[PDB]
Every structure is written in C-alpha cells, then in structure tokens.
A = this chain, B = another copy of it.
C-alpha cells in the first residue's frame, strides 16, 4: 500500500473542498448581498412613508 495513490485522492478531497469553498463563498456573498438588499429596502419601506399635510 503506497501513499502515492493517497495523493491522487488527497487532490480530490482538496479540490471538491476548494470548489465547495469557492461556491459557498459565492453562495455566501450572495447570501450577504441579499441580506443587505432586504435591509436597505427594509428601512426604505418604513422611511419612504408619505403624508397628508394640513387641511
């Protein structure tokens, strides 16, 4: 049994990690960038209120 083949796999473990890492970050930024949008809209929802002024 040789670690030469272990290397072959170790790539695969690392690569799928990096890809998941890659996407999760992308998934994550979008998560964040979405989380920001709802917040901006959220404040804009309340503060965009319009009012009847006087009689």
Name A's B-contacting residues (CB within 8 A): 2, 4, 7-8, 10-11, 14-15, 17-18, 21-22, 24-25, 27-29, 31-35, 38-39, 41-43, 45-46, 49, 51-52
From B25, B35, B45, B46, A49 is in contact (CB under 8 Å) with: B25
**Cα distance A39–B28 when bound, in Å?**
22
If over half of A's interface residues share one DSSP class (helix, strand or loop), that class is named, otherwise mixed; here it is helix
Least Cβ–Cβ distance between A42 and chain B, in angstroms: 4
Count the copies: 2
**Cα distance A25–B7 when bound, in Å?**
13
From B7, B17, B31, B43, A7 is in contact (CB under 8 Å) with: B31
Residues B7 and A34 in contact, CB atoms below 8 Å apart: yes
